[PDB]
């Protein structure tokens, strides 16, 4: 047996963030 | 021969979330 | 012995920023 392989490619983008909070009531 | 390499670096931060529901009228 | 293949893809990154609040 020989050496371990090179390191893999960089991962994908993380999960999309939470939707913003509902706005406050207007005047 | 040898084993496959370690996992790559961690990926990018996710996309920013959609905006909030623009608040109701007064 | 010759080296193994490149490893797997890395884990996905952190979760995105929370979205902006809705307008007043």
């Amino acid at each position, epitope marked *: 047996p020989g050496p371990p392989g090179p390191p893999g490619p*960089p991962g994908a983008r993380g999960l999309t963030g939470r939707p913003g909070d509902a706005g406050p009531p207007g005047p | 021969p040898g084993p496959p390499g370690p996992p790559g*670096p961690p990926g*990018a*931060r996710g996309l*920013t979330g959609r905006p909030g529901d623009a608040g109701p009228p007064g | 012995g010759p080296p193994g293949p490149p490893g797997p893809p890395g*884990p996905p990154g*952190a*979760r995105g*920023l929370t979205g902006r609040p809705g307008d007043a």
Partner: antibody, heavy 119, light 112 residues
Framework: QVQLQQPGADLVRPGVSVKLSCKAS????????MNWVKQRPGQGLEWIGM????????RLSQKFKDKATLTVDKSSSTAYMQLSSPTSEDSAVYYC????????????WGQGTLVTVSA | DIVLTQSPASLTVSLGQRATISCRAS??????????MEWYQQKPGQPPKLLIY???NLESGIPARFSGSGSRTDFTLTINPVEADDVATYYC?????????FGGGTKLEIKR
């Protein structure tokens, strides 16, 4: 070693567009967001926006939406930020910056470009 | 925007003393068990340098004299004992909500 290379200075007349560069090395450029931050000397910091070079997906601060334009060149591993019709309020240090891979904290920073808006 | 208010604006401290810098957020920066608060040190002519991530985690290469605590809307940066090299401006920054936002900073000056 991660590296974000920015010119020290950029001088424009009032009204002439400035285009800032941030040359990246030491990592896979197309895999990570590039963020831009503004700092007037003597003052605090403002996040401008970010761009992901793989698909040129973009988020801009609402304050800068009509002011800043973010692009990349995959071939030279360079991120650009263009500022329209500059005024004296646009004179500032501008940094490019990066989150730690898998993280949510700005671990890497360019040295900054001092933009001067002057005749 | 999440607004971060730092206190005080400037702090004067003798060598070997404890320095305490406060940061309040206009709304919570906690998400799914994590506090999205960073602390930076900035010396003149240099970019901000990361000290503390996720409220309390020491960044590699940062001495243990620096520590961070808090959650929700209240955060603290502690320097103990203070050293000469620590003269600087310090910033908190939230990384929870779009857009990223910074505190106005705290200048650390040393009494001698």
């Amino acid at each position: 070693q991660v590296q974000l290379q920015q010119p020290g200075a950029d001088l424009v007349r009032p009204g002439v567009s400035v285009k800032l560069s941030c040359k990246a090395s030491g990592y896979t450029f197309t895999s990570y967001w590039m963020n831009w931050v503004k700092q007037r000397p003597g003052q605090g910091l403002e996040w401008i926006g970010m761009i992901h070079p793989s698909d040129s997906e973009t988020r801009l601060s609402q304050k800068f939406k009509d002011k800043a334009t973010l692009t990349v060149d995959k071939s030279s591993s360079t991120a650009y930020m263009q500022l329209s019709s500059p005024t004296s309020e646009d004179s500032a240090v501008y940094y490019c910056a990066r989150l730690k891979p898998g993280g949510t904290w700005f671990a890497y920073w360019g040295q900054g470009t001092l933009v001067t808006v002057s005749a | 925007d999440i607004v971060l208010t730092q206190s005080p604006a400037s702090l004067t401290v003798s060598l070997g003393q404890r320095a305490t810098i406060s940061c309040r957020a206009s709304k919570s920066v906690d998400s799914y068990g994590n506090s999205f608060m960073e602390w930076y040190q900035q010396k003149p002519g240099q970019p901000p340098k990361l000290l503390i991530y996720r409220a309390s985690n020491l960044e590699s290469g940062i001495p243990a004299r620096f520590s961070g605590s808090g959650s929700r809307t209240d955060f603290t940066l502690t320097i103990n004992p203070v050293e000469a090299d620590d003269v600087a401006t310090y910033y908190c920054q939230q990384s929870n909500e779009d857009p990223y936002t910074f505190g106005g900073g705290t200048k650390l000056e040393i009494k001698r």
